[PDB]
Curated annotation (Swiss-Prot):
There is a cross-link at residue 17 (Glycyl lysine isopeptide (Lys-Gly) (interchain with G-Cter in ubiquitin)). This is Peroxisome proliferator-activated receptor gamma. Rosiglitazone binds at residues 65-68, 102, 226, 248. Coiled coil: none annotated. A motif (9aaTAD) lies at residues 242-248. Nuclear receptor that binds peroxisome proliferators such as hypolipidemic drugs and fatty acids. Once activated by a ligand, the nuclear receptor binds to DNA specific PPAR response elements (PPRE) and modulates the transcription of its target genes, such as acyl-CoA oxidase. It therefore controls the peroxisomal beta-oxidation pathway of fatty acids. Key regulator of adipocyte differentiation and glucose homeostasis. ARF6 acts as a key regulator of the tissue-specific adipocyte P2 (aP2) enhancer. (Microbial infection) Upon treatment with M.tuberculosis or its lipoprotein LpqH, phosphorylation of MAPK p38 and IL-6 production are modulated, probably via this protein. Residues 3-248 form the NR LBD domain. Phosphorylated in basal conditions and dephosphorylated when treated with the ligand. May be dephosphorylated by PPP5C. It comes from Homo sapiens. Induction: (Microbial infection) Expression increases when incubated with M.tuberculosis or its lipoprotein LpqH; induction is TLR2-dependent (at protein level).
Length: 248
């Protein structure tokens, strides 16, 4: 039990060290807290180009593409610090990440979100949900917002997210994995540690562990729909990053 707690601290340390915008910073920026600075708000085309100070719809997709890329670099950096990940068969490390990064992006994306919009550029900016929903065509972050709303109601902090994200990466159901068993061995560990952490950090909360695993369903749905859209865009525009091209 003391070992699981120690494993939780490790993941947390590494999470802090791998992701410069945490959920705690992001919430401070959103709630006008004096620990951090207020963002500029992008709510329309006028304030959009007013906010680039700092086609529009194409410019914002490419922007999301560039931010996704950095996300992958940071998530990759984080995976290397999960005990046993770097000991795994190389082809599988690549496999696990290739299929997990999207799921993690949306998880941490919820960290940047409220029912009214999302933080961007390390909290410097705040693009509104309506402005995005009105962006066209095609430009329709709306399901990401609905998951965010549901997701953020669990009220997990960064030390929760750190373990949960580790679990996601270590998914032995990932397609085309050579050796499944060691990955599962690691995930079982992460899982058991997530169980204890949620039981210690949210004691009044019931079945939060179960509730937190169920959300992995929602994540699959989101990512499938995302990939479909991106494939349609790829055939309606002739002219992705070498990392972006790799995952897709
Ligand atoms: O612009 C932002 O920072 C939000 C954003 C949009 C698209 C893709 C990624 C990100 N941010 C982001 C980053 Cl930079 C790292 C880890 C997880 C997330 Cl959600």
């Amino acid at each position: 039990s003391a070992d699981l707690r120690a494993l939780a601290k490790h993941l947390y340390d590494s999470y802090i060290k791998s992701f410069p915008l945490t959920k705690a910073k992001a919430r401070a920026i959103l709630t006008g807290k004096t620990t951090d600075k207020s963002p500029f708000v992008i709510y329309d085309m006028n304030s959009l180009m007013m906010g680039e100070d700092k086609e529009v719809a194409i410019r914002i997709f490419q922007g999301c593409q560039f931010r996704s890329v950095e996300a992958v670099q940071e998530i990759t950096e984080y995976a290397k610090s999960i005990p046993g990940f770097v000991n795994l068969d190389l082809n599988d490390q690549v496999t696990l990440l290739k299929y997990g990064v999207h799921e993690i992006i949306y998880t941490m994306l919820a960290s940047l979100m409220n029912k009214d919009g999302v933080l961007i550029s390390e909290g410097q900016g705040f693009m509104t949900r309506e402005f995005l929903k009105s962006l066209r065509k095609p430009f329709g972050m709306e399901p990401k917002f609905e998951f965010a709303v549901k997701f953020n109601a669990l009220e997990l902090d960064d030390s929760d997210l750190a373990i949960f994200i580790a679990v996601i990466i270590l998914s032995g159901d990932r397609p085309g994995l050579l050796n499944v068993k060691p990955i599962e061995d690691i995930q079982d560990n992460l899982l058991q540690a997530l169980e204890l952490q949620l039981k210690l950090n949210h004691p009044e909360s019931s079945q939060l562990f179960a509730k937190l695993l169920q959300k992995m369903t929602d994540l699959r749905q989101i990512v499938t729909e995302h990939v479909q859209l991106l494939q349609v865009i790829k055939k309606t525009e002739t002219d992705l990053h070498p990392l972006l091209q790799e995952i897709y």
